[PDB]
């Protein structure tokens, strides 16, 4: 999320949760294989459907309801 060092010298940052078996997007450096970096983590459609409570199927976000 963010990481850095203060003027005093102490380091600060974050350690976002890591999960086994999750799907992660990867982007190779300079399009050279054997150099992966994870861009983000994306869940399955079933998992996303399970962890949301919105009953609406669709609609424009600008609507008040």
């Amino acid at each position: 999320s963010f990481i850095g060092r203060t003027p005093e010298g102490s380091v600060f940052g974050t350690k976002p949760l890591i999960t086994e078996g999750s799907v992660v997007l990867i982007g190779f450096l300079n399009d050279d294989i054997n150099s992966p970096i994870i861009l983000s983590v994306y869940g399955d459609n079933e998992q996303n459907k399970m962890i949301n409570t919105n009953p609406l199927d669709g609609g424009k976000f600008d609507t008040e309801s």
Binding site: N30, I33, S35
Partner: protein, 64 residues
């Protein structure tokens, strides 16, 4: 060995098609200078770079 007695035709000469001044053998692409140890340590000659300045030749070795 082969003498000139067996030569039918010849086409040989110099060429400046390949010309490099700095040579290096970097490790695999996984290692990186910002998030790791030293990445490279090239070599050059002070007189060679005058005619061809900062002409690099990079090769990636999977063994290292």
């Amino acid at each position: 060995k082969v003498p000139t007695e067996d030569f039918i035709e010849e086409d040989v000469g110099k060429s400046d098609v390949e010309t490099y001044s700095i040579f290096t053998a970097t490790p695999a692409g996984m290692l990186k200078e910002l998030n790791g140890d030293v990445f490279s340590k090239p070599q050059f000659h002070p007189e060679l770079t005058d005619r061809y300045g900062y002409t690099k030749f990079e090769v990636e070795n999977i063994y290292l």
